[PDB]
Design a protein around this ligand. Sequence first.
Ligand code: VO4
Length: 282
Amino acid sequence: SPYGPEARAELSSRLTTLRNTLAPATNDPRYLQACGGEKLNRFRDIQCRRQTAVRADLNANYIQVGNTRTIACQYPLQSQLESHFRMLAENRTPVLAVLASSSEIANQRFGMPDYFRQSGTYGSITVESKMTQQVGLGDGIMADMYTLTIREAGQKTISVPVVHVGNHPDQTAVSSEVTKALASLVDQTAETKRNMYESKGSSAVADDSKLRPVIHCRAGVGRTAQLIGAMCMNDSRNSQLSVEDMVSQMRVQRNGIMVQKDEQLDVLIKLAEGQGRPLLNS
Ligand code: VO4
């Protein structure tokens, strides 16, 4: 019963209502608006909740799902790279997980700069990329890892671990098993880096807005939300958090498209069922 078609239909019904309620109006006070004529939103109808926005010129949100704290964002536009790097550095980012594939990044029509696999200078910020490990996730899917060193006069230099799912499929979802492996890798990578900051006495450890994993695909609502949901199920502090709760939390804190596709919700439901976690709130 709890994972049957009726329960699943009720879950989808609740979530569809929420998506509709959260749809952005023109100049919606709930959503971040572009300053002037520079593009803010990569996709016109995928907007950034104002109250949880990380920076005034990025489409990026703080999200807390149960006890699990992250940042979800869109793939930065070329014009946003300096601001995006400053976000990454100021956050003392313990892991950046990029779920857009190499093939997507190479597709010039998508306007996704290869900002983490190449070195470059963006305004005042210079960035160096180095390749590190490669970790298989299952089904031939590979996580390629990097360290991104971000340098800027007047700022402390920050190095950010990157997990890039370079061969993420482009028109289907990855399985629950691959998602679980990816969530574990991302969480573990973050824990190692967070620990380094704690050992050094960084003030960021005490700041709820910092030390957050940063996750994006192209829009930051599909693959990204599937991963964030899996991460929250990987956190033993989140007992009794339902699938309804987690998807509602993501939507209210970013936008109504979080968990964009039914295929992605299917994975979250399967992960929840494996844990005996509820789908719905009573
Ligand atoms: O500027 V710190 O995040 O090393 O206290």
